[PDB]
Short mmCIF file of N, CA and C and ligand atoms in Angstrom, two decimals:
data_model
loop_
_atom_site.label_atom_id
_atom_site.label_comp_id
_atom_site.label_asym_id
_atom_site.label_seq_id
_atom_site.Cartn_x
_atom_site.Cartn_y
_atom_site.Cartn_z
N UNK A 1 -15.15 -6.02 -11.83
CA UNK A 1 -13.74 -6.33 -12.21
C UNK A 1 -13.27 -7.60 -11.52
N UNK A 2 -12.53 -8.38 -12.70
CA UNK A 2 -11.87 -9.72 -11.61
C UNK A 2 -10.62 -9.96 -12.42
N UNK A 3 -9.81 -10.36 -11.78
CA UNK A 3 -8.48 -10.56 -12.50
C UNK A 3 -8.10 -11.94 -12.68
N UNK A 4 -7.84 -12.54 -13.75
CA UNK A 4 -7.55 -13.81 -13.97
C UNK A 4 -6.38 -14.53 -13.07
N UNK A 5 -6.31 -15.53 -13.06
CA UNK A 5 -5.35 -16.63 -12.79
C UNK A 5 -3.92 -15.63 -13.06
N UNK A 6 -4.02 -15.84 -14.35
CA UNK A 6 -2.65 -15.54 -14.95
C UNK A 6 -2.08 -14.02 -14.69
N UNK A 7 -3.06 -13.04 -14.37
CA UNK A 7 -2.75 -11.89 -14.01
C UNK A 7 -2.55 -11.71 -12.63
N UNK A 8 -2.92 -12.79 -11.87
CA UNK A 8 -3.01 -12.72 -10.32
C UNK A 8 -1.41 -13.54 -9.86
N UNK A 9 -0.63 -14.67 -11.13
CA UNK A 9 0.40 -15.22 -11.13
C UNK A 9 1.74 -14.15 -11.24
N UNK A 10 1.08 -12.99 -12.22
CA UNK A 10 2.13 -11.81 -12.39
C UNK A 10 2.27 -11.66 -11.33
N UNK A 11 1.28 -10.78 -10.49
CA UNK A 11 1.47 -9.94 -9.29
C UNK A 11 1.89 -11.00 -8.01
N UNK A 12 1.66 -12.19 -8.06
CA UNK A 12 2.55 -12.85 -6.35
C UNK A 12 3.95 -13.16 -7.24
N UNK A 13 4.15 -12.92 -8.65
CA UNK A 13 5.59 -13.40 -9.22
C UNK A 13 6.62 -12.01 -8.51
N UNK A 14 6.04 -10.73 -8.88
CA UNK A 14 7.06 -9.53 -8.45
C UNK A 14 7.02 -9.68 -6.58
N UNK A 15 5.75 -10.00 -6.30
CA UNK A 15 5.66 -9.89 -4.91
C UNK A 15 6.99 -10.83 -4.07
N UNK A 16 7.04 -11.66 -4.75
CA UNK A 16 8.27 -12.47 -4.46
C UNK A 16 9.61 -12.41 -4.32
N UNK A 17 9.68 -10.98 -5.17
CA UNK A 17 11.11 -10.52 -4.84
C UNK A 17 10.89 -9.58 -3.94
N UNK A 18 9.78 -8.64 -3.63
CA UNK A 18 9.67 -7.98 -2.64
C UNK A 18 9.71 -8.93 -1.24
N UNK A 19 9.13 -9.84 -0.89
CA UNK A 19 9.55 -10.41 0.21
C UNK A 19 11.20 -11.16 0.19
N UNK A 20 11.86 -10.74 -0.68
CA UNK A 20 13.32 -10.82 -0.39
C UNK A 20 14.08 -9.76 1.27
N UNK A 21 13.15 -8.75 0.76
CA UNK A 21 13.67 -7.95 1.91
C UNK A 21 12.48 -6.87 1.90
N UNK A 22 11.42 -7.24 2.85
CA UNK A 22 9.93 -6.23 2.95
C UNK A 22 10.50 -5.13 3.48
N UNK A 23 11.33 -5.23 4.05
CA UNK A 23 11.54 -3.93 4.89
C UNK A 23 12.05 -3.06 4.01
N UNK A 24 13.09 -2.89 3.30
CA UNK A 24 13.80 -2.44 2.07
C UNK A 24 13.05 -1.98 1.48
N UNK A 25 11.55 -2.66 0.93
CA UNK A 25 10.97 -2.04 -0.22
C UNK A 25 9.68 -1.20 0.78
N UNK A 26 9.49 -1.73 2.41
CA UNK A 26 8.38 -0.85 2.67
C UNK A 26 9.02 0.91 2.75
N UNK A 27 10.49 0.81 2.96
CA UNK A 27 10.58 2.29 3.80
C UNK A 27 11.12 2.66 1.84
N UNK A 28 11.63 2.14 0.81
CA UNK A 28 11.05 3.27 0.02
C UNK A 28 10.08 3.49 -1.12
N UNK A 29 8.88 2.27 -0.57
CA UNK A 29 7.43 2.84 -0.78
C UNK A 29 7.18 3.67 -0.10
N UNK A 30 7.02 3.67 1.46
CA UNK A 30 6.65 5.18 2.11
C UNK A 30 7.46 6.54 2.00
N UNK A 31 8.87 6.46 1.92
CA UNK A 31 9.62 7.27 1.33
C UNK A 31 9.02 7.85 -0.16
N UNK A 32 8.75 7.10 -1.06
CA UNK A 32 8.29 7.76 -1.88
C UNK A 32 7.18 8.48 -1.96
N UNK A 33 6.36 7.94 -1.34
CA UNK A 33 4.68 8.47 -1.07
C UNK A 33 5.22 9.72 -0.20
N UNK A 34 5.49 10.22 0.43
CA UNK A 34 5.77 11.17 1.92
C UNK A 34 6.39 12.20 0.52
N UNK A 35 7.53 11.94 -0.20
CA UNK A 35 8.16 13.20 -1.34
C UNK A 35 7.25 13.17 -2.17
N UNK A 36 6.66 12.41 -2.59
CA UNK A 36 5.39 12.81 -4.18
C UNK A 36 4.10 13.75 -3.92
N UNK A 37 3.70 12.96 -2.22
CA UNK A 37 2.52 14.14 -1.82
C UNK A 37 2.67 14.16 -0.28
N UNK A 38 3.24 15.38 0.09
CA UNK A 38 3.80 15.30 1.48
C UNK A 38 2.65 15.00 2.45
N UNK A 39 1.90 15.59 1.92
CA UNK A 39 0.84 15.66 2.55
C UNK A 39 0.13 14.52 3.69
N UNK A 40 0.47 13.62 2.54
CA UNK A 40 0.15 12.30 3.08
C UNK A 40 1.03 11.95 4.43
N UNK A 41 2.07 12.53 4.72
CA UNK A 41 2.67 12.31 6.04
C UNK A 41 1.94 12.82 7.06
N UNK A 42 1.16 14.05 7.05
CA UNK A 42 0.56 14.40 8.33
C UNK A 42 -0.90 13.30 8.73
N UNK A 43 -0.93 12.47 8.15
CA UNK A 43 -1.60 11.95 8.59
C UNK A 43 -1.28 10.56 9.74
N UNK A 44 0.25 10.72 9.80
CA UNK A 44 0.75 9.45 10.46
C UNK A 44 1.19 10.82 11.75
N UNK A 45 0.58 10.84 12.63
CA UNK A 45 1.33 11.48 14.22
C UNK A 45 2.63 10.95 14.49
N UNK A 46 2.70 9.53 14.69
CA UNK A 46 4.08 9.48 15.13
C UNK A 46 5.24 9.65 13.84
N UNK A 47 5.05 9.93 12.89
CA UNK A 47 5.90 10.43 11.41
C UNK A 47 6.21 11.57 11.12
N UNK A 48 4.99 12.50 11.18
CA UNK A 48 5.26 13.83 10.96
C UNK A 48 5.92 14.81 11.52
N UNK A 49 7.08 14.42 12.10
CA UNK A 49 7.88 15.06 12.24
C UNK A 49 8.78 14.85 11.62
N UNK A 50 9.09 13.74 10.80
CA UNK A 50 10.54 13.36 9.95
C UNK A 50 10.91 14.67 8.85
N UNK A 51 11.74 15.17 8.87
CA UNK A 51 12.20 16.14 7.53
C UNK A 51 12.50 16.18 6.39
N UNK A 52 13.56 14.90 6.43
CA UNK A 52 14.17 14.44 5.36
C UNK A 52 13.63 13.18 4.77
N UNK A 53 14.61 12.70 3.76
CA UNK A 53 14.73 10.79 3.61
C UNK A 53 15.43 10.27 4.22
N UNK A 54 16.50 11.38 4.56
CA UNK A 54 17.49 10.69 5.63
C UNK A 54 16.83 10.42 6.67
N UNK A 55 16.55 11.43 7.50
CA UNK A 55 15.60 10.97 8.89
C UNK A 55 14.51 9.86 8.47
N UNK A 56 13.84 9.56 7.29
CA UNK A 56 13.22 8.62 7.20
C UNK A 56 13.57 7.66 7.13
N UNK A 57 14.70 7.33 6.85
CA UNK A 57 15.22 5.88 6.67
C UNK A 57 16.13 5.59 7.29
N UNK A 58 16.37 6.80 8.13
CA UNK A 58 16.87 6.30 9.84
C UNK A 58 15.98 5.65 11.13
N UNK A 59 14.25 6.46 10.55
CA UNK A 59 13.82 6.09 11.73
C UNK A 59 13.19 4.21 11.99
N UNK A 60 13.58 3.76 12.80
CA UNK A 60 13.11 2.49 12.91
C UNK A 60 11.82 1.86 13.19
N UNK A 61 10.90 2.86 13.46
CA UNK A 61 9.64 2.43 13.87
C UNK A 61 8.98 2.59 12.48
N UNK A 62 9.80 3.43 11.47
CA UNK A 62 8.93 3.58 10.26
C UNK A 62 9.46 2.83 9.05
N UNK A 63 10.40 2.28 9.58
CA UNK A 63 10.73 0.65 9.14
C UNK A 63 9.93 -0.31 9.24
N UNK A 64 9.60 -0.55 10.76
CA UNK A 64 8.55 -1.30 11.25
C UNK A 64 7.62 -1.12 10.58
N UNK A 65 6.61 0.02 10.57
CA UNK A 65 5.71 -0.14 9.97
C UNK A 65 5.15 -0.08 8.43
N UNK A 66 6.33 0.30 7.52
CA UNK A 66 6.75 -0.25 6.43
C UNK A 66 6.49 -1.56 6.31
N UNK A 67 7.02 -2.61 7.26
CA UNK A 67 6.34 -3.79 6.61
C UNK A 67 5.38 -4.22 7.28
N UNK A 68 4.82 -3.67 8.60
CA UNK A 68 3.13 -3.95 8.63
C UNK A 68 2.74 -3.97 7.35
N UNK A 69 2.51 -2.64 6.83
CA UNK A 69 2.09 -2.49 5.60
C UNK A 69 2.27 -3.27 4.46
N UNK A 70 3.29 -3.43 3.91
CA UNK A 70 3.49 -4.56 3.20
C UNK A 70 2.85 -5.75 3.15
N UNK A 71 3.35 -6.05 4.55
CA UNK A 71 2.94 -7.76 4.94
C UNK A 71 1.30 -7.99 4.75
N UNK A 72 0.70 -6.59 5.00
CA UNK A 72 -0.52 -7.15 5.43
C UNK A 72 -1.40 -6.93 3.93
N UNK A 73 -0.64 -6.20 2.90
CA UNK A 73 -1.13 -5.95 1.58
C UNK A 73 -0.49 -7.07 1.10
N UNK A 74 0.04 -8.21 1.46
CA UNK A 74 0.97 -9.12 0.79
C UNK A 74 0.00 -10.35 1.46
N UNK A 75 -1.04 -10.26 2.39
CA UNK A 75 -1.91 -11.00 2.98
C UNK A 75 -2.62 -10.91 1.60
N UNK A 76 -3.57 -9.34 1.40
CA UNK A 76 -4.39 -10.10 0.73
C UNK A 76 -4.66 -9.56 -0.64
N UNK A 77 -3.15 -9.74 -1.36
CA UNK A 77 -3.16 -10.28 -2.76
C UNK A 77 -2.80 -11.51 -2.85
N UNK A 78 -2.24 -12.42 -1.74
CA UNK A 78 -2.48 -13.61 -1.76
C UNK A 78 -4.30 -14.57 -1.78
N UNK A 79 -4.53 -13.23 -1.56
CA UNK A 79 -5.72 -14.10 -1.61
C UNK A 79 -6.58 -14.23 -2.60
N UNK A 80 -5.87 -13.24 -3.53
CA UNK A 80 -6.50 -13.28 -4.98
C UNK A 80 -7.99 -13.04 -4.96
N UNK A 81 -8.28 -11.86 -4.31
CA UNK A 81 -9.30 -11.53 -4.26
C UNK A 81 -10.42 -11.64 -3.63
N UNK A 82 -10.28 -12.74 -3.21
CA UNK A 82 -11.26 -13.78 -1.83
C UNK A 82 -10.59 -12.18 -0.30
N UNK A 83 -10.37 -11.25 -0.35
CA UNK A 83 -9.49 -10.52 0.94
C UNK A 83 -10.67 -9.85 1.45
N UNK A 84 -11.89 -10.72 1.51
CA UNK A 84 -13.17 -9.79 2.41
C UNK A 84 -12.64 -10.03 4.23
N UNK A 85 -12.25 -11.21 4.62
CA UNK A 85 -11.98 -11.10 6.02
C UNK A 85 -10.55 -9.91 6.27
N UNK A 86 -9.94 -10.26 5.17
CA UNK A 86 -8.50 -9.32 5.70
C UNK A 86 -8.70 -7.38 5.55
N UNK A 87 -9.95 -7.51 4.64
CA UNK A 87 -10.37 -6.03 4.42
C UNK A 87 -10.87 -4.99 5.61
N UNK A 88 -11.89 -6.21 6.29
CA UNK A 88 -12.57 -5.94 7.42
C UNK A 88 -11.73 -4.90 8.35
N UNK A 89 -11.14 -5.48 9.48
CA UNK A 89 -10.04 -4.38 10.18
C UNK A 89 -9.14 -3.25 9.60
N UNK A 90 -8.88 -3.51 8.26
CA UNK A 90 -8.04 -2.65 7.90
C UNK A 90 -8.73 -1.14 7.39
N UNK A 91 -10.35 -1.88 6.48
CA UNK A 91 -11.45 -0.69 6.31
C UNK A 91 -11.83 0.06 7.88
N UNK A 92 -11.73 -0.74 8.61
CA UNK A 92 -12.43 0.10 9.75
C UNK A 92 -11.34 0.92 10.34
N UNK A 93 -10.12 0.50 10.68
CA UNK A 93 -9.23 1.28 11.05
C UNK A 93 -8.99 2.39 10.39
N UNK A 94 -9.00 2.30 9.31
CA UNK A 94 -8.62 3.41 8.22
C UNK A 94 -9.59 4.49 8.15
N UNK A 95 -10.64 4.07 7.76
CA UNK A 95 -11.69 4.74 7.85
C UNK A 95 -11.87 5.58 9.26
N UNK A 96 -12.23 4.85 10.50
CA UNK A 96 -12.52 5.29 11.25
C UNK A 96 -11.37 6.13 12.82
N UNK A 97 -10.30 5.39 12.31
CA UNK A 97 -9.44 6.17 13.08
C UNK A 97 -8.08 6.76 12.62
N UNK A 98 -7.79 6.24 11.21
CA UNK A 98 -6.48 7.22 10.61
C UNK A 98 -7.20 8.15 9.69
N UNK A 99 -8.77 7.85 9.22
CA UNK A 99 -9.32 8.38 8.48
C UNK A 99 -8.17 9.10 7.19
N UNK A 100 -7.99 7.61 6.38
CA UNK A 100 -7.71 7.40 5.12
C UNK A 100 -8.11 7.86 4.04
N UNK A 101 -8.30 8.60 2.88
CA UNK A 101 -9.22 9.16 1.74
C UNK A 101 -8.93 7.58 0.78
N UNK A 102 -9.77 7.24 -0.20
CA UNK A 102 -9.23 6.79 -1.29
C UNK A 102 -8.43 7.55 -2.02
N UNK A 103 -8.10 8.77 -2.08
CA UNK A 103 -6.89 9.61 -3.05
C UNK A 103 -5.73 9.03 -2.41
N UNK A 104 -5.75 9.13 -1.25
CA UNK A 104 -4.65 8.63 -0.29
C UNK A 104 -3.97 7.39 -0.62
N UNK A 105 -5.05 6.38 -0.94
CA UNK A 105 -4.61 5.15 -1.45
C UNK A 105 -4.44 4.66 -2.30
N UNK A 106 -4.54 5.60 -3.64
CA UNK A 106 -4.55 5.72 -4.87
C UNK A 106 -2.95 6.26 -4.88
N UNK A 107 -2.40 7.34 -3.62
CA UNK A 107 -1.12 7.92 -3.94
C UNK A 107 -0.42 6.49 -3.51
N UNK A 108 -0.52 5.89 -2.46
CA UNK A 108 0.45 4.74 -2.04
C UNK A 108 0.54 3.44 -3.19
N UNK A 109 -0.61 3.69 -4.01
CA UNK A 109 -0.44 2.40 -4.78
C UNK A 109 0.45 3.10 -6.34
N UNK A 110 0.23 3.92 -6.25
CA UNK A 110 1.23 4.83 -7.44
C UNK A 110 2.77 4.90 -6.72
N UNK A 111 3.19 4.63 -5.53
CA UNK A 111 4.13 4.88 -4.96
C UNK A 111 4.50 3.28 -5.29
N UNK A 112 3.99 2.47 -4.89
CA UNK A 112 4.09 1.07 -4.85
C UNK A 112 4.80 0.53 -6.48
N UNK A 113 3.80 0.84 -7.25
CA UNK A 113 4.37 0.69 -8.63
C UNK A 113 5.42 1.34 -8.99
N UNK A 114 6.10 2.87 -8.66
CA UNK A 114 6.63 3.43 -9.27
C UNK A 114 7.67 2.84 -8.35
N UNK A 115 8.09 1.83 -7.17
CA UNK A 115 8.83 1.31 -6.54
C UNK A 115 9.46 -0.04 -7.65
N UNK A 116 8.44 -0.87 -7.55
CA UNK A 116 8.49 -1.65 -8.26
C UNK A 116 8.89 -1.60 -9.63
N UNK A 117 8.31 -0.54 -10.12
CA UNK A 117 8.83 -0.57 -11.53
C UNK A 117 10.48 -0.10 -11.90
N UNK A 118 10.74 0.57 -10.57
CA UNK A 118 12.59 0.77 -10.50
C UNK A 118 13.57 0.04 -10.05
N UNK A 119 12.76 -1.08 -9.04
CA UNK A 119 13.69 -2.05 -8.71
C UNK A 119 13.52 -3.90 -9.03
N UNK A 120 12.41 -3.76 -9.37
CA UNK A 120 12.38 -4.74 -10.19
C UNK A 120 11.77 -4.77 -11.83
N UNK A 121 12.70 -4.02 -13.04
CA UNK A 121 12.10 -4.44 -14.01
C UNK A 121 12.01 -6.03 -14.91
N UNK A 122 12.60 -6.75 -14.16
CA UNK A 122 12.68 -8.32 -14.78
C UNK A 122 11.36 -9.17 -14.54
N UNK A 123 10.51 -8.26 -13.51
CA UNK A 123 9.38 -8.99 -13.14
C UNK A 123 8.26 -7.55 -12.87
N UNK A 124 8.64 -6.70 -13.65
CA UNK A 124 7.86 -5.90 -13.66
C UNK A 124 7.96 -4.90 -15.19
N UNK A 125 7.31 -6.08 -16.35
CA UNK A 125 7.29 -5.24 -16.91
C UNK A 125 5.41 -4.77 -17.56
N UNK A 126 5.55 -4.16 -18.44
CA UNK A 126 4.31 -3.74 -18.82
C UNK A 126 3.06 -4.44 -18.69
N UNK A 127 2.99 -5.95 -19.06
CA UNK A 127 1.73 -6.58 -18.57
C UNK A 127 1.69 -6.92 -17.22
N UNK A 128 3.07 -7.29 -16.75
CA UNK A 128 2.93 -7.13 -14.95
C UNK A 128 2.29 -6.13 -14.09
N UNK A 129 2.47 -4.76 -14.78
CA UNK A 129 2.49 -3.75 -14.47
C UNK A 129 0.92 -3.60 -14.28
N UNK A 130 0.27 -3.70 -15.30
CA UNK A 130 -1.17 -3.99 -15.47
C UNK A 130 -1.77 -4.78 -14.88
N UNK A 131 -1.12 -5.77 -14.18
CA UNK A 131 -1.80 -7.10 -13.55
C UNK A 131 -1.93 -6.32 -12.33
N UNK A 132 -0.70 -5.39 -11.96
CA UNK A 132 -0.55 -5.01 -9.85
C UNK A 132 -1.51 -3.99 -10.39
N UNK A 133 -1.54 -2.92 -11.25
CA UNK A 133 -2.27 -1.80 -11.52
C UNK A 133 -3.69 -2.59 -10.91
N UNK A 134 -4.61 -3.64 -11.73
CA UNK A 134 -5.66 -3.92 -11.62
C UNK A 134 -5.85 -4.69 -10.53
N UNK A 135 -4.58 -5.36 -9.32
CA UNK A 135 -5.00 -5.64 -8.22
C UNK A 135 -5.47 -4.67 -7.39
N UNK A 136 -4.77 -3.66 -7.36
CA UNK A 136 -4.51 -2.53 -6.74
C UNK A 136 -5.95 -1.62 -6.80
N UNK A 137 -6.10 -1.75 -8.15
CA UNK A 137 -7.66 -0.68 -8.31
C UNK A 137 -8.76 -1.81 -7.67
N UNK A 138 -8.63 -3.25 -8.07
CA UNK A 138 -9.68 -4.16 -7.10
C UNK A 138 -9.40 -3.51 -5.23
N UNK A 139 -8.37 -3.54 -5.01
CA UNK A 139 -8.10 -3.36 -3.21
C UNK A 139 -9.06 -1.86 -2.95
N UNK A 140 -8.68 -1.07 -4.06
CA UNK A 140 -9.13 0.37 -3.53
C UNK A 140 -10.77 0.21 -3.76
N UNK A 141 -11.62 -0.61 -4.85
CA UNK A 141 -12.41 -0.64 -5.16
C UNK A 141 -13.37 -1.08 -3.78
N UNK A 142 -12.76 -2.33 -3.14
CA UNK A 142 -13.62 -3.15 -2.14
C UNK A 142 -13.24 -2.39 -0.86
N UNK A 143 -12.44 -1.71 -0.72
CA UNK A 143 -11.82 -0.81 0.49
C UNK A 143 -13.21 0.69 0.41
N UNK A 144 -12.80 1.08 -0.87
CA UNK A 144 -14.30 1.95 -1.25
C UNK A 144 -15.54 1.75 -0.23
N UNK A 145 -15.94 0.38 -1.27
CA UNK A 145 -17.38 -0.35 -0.72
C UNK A 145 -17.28 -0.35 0.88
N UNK A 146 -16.52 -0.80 1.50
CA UNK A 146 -16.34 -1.21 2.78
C UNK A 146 -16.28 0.04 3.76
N UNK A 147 -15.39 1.54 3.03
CA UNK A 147 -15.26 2.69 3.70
C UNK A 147 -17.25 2.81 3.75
N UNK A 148 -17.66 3.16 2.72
CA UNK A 148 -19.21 3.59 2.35
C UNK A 148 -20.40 2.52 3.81
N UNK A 149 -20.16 1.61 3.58
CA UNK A 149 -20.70 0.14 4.35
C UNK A 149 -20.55 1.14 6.19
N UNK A 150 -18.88 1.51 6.02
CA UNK A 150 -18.66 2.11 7.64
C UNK A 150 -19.05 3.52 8.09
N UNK A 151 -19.49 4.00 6.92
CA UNK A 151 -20.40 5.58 7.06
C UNK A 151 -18.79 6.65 6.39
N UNK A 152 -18.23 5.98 6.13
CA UNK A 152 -17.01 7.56 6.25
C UNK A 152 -16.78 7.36 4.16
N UNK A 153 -16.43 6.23 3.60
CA UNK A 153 -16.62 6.44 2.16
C UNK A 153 -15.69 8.03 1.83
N UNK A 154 -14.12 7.35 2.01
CA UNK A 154 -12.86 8.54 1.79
C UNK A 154 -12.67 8.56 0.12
C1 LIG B 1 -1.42 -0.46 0.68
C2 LIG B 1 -2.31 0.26 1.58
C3 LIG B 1 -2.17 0.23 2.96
C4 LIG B 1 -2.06 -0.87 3.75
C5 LIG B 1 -2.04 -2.33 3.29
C6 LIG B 1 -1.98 -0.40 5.12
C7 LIG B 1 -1.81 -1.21 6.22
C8 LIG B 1 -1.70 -0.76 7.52
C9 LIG B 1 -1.57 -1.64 8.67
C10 LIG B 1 -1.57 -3.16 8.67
C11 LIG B 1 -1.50 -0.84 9.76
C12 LIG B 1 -1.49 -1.29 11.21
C13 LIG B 1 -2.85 -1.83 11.68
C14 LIG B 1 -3.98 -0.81 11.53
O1 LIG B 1 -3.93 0.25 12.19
O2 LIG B 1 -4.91 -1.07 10.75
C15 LIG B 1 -1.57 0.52 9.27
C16 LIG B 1 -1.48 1.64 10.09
C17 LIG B 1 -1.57 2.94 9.65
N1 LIG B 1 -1.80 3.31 8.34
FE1 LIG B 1 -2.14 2.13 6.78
N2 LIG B 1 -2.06 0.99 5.18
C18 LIG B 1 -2.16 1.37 3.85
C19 LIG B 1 -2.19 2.67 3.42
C20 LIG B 1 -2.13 3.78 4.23
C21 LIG B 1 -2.07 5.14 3.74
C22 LIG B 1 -2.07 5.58 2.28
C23 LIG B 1 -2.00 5.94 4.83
C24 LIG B 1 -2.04 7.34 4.86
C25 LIG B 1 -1.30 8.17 3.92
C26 LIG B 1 -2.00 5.06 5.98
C27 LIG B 1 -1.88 5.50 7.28
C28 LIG B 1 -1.79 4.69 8.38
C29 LIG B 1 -1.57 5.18 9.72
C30 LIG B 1 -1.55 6.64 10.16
C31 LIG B 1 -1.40 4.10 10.51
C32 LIG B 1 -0.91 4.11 11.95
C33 LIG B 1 0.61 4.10 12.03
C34 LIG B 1 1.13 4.09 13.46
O3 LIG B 1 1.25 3.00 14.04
O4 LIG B 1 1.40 5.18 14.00
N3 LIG B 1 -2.08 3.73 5.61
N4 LIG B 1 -1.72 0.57 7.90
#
């Protein structure tokens, strides 16, 4: 799989309003991911204790790391695919010490879109939609390879 020019222009076009305010859109991407499959919260220790959305989008460290996240998925779809150095640390961390599944990252990128597709439909519409869809399945694809490469393959 490789995504063209023009499909790679969609996805840094919406990304652009998301860096209007990363923080905004990281806490309700993770907000959304945490209510769609809770599950996915016990895997963050310092999180799993939050109850609500309220407590989630009170707490400030999960602000913070709302746009780690972001920022560093905003690294490398800039890179349009070339993201083998930026993959590196993030496969190993994941893999080896938050021990990440790919389902896991399949729920955050369904969280991601279904973000996007509510707050920005002017730059998110159906072929956009398809452009982040197929960045997104490239990230999980080489994240795959890279989990498998580190022995754990979630
Ligand atoms: C778009 C996909 C994701 C990106 C770009 C991403 C990025 C990051 C980054 C940059 C960090 C900090 C550095 C590091 O530890 O590697 C981090 C930490 C972490 N990530 Fe991910 N992550 C993603 C998805 C997930 C998912 C789906 C989960 C689990 C449901 C997850 C769980 C964690 C945990 C537990 C930490 C540690 C948080 C803490 O500081 O307590 N990540 N992630």
């Amino acid at each position: 799989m490789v995504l063209s020019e023009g499909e790679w222009q969609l996805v840094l076009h919406v990304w652009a309003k998301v860096e209007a305010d990363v923080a905004g859109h990281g806490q309700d991407i993770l907000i959304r991911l945490f209510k769609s499959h809770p599950e996915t919260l016990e895997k963050f220790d310092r999180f799993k204790h939050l109850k609500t959305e309220a407590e989630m989008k009170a707490s400030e460290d999960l602000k913070k790391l709302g746009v780690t996240n972001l920022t560093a998925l905003g690294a490398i779809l800039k890179k349009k695919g070339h993201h083998e150095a930026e993959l590196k640390p993030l496969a190993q961390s994941h893999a080896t010490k938050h021990k990440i599944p790919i389902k896991y990252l399949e729920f955050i990128s369904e969280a991601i879109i279904h973000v996007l597709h509510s707050r920005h439909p002017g730059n998110f519409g159906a072929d956009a939609q398809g452009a982040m869809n197929k960045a997104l399945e490239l990230f999980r694809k080489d994240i795959a390879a890279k989990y498998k490469e580190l022995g754990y393959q979630g």
